[PDB]
Design a protein around this ligand. Sequence first.
Ligand SMILES: Nc1ncnc2c1ncn2[C@@H]1O[C@H](COP(=O)(O)NCCc2c[nH]c3ccccc23)[C@@H](O)[C@H]1O
Ligand SMILES: [Cl-]
Lengths: 112, 115
Amino acid sequence: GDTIFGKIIRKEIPAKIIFEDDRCLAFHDISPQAPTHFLVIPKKHISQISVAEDDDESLLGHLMIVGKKCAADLGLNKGYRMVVNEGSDGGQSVYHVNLHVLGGRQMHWPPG
Amino acid sequence: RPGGDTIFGKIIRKEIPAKIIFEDDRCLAFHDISPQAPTHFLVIPKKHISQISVAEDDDESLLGHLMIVGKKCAADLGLNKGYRMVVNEGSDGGQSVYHVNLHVLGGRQMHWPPG
Ligand SMILES: Nc1ncnc2c1ncn2[C@@H]1O[C@H](COP(=O)(O)NCCc2c[nH]c3ccccc23)[C@@H](O)[C@H]1O
Ligand SMILES: [Cl-]
């Protein structure tokens, strides 16, 4: 079913958009866990990484390339952490695939 | 040398031991020596890329392949309740081996924030 991230893609509710193309959208997370914390999501509604199809491989990599380019544009020259959550144990909060990018502070270990 | 001389390049060339889960022409999945969850493994490209910040545009398929392999390995390992994937960049990310590596962690509740 639809999620709040679908509404964001459709521009029905506001978000602070960082980057957009024909197949993905990057925007700041509304509940930031670091001084910079944004999401990169595909426009295709893949609900979770566990159901991603083989044909989605380059799209998923595109999310990471967009994410790293956005991180550089946002000044994260000391580094950052990328996260994808799956399911209950993964703490996934929205059932639309989303790549978190967090930086601007030391990220710790374990990663949750 | 194919893979470079980080410890992950050594693992790729079978020069240092690893507990391998899956291997193909593009990548390798193997268990982390310092697990942070009951299941904790890594998926790495066989092509040496030092860190995500220097990945090239044409690396998209390879990077996505790491995630597809990661999720397939997670299912094969019975992580039916979910898992977390992590890629660390640089000092603030906590990167400690400069060869791109995707962590897959599961078998317990992961917490927020992710470090
Ligand atoms: N022979 C070997 N066989 C198998 N695994 C090995 C290994 N040799 C090292 N490994 C693992 O390779 C991973 C590298 O992951 P990152 O570069 O993302 N650093 C994250 C940790 C961190 C190190 N310092 C930090 C500081 C802050 C946050 C996180 C960290 C670690 O989990 C190691 O256990
Ligand atoms: Cl999530």
